[PDB]
Design a protein around this ligand. Structure first.
Ligand SMILES: CCCCCCCCCO[C@@H]1O[C@H](CO)[C@@H](O)[C@H](O)[C@H]1O
Ligand SMILES: O=[N+]([O-])c1ccc(O[C@H]2O[C@H](CO)[C@H](O)[C@H](O)[C@H]2O)cc1
Length: 387
């Protein structure tokens, strides 16, 4: 099949390039650029600031272009600059000169990745229902491409720590290739503003601010929580990329069967089920005592992704007009998720101190479970009462 294999490999090489930068990002600043953690909380604040003017902006374009590939050409164009970004630009600029004047080099990561990954999901999602395949399939490539690169980072961490970027950049032109050969064949912005007074959006986004925002702030400093339950902070880290690498292969597997499960259960129960798996991880982490316990908890993250990603599209397409699938994705499951993740993280630090780590996860989990249970009623569609 023409589109499936091209855009399936597109995810493979796209997330390979996100898998070098992202899943080990704080370490890069910590060790390899010697940046204090009283300064990395300001870098993320600017990588998430250019993400807020791009994410909605990418949503309207990703619809107005429809199946036109221009917006995805820009991304594949900017991703070629990946190697000389980290190695020669971003790297020396943040340290030697002021962090503020280099925190605007997090514009790059705002465009390509934080606001560009979901634009790739959304676009390939539209193509996913003009060809004959399921979005969960092909998207499953992202996890294994993420896993492949994930291993190589650790495998290459002491050998040549610039290599992952150089290889990453080489895949960007491979990404240009697959974008070209693949062959694939409305609204106005004032109709777009109609959705914001439709009360069916308010309850979808409520679910995101409630369940998904709480979950992604929970997975913020999970690295600090995870390490304590290994004998050495360092040795626990050395087992961390093992879990991440391995569990992502499982994650693709879970996603493999995801769309079949998703297609009948329906969209709403897909999110409710995702919300339950999310809440279970957030609450049950309060009852963590041993390494095996915390390891298995982290693997719930691999049960969670398929249902959230695949499910949200099934929801957005099923209950909303498709003339807005990219927009209400990049505004609800990305923008509104990111906008609320500014504040829910702020008082997650005033809960690390105010009531400890496991006591912080308890407040979050009962807000996560809180809004999961609430969205059986606020979300329109068929609830779990049907089966
Ligand atoms: C504006 C200031 C920019 C400073 C940039 C410093 C670049 C240093 C590059 O080092 C080289 O890296 C290669 C891999 O990238 C290795 O193969 C090689 O052994 C090593 O010598
Ligand atoms: O910028 N974002 O919006 C964004 C970046 C990375 C990301 O990673 C997810 O997909 C990855 C590959 O599939 C892994 O599975 C990972 O475990 C998931 O969390 C998700 C969202």
């Amino acid at each position: 099949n023409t589109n499936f294999w091209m855009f399936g490999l597109f995810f493979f090489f796209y997330f390979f390039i996100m898998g070098a930068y992202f899943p080990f990002f704080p370490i890069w600043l910590h060790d390899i650029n010697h940046i204090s953690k009283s300064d990395t909380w300001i870098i993320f604040a600017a990588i998430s600031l250019f993400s807020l003017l791009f994410q909605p902006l990418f949503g309207l374009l990703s619809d107005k272009l429809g199946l036109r590939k221009y917006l995805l050409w820009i991304i594949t164009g900017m991703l070629v600059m990946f190697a000389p970004f980290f190695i020669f630009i971003f790297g020396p600029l943040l340290q030697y000169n002021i962090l503020v004047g280099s925190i605007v080099g997090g514009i790059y990561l705002g465009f390509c990745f934080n606001a560009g990954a979901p634009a790739v999901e959304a676009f390939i999602e539209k193509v996913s229902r003009r060809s004959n395949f399921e979005f969960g399939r092909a998207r499953m490539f992202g996890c294994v491409g993420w896993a492949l690169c994930a291993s190589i980072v650790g495998i290459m961490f002491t050998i040549n720590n610039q290599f992952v970027f150089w290889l990453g950049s080489g895949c960007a032109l491979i990404l240009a290739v697959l974008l070209f050969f693949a062959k694939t064949d409305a609204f106005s912005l004032k109709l777009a503003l109609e959705l914001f007074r439709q009360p069916k959006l308010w309850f979808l986004s409520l679910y995101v601010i409630g369940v998904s925002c709480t979950y992604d702030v929970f997975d913020q400093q999970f690295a600090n929580f995870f390490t304590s339950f290994f004998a050495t902070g360092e040795q626990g880290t050395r087992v961390f990329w093992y879990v991440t690498t391995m569990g992502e292969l499982l994650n693709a597997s879970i996603m493999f069967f995801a769309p079949l499960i998703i297609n009948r259960i329906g969209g709403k129960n897909a999110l409710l089920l995702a919300g339950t798996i999310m809440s279970v991880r957030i609450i049950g982490s309060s009852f963590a005592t041993s390494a095996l316990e915390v390891v298995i908890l982290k693997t719930l993250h691999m049960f969670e992704v398929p249902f959230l990603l695949v499910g949200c599209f099934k929801y957005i397409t099923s209950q909303f007009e498709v003339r807005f699938s990219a927009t209400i994705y990049l505004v609800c499951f990305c923008f509104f998720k990111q906008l609320a993740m500014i504040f829910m993280s702020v008082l997650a630090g005033n809960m690390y101190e105010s009531i400890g780590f496991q006591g912080a996860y308890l407040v979050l989990g009962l807000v996560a479970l809180g809004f999961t249970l609430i969205s059986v009623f606020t979300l329109s569609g068929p609830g779990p009462l049907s089966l």
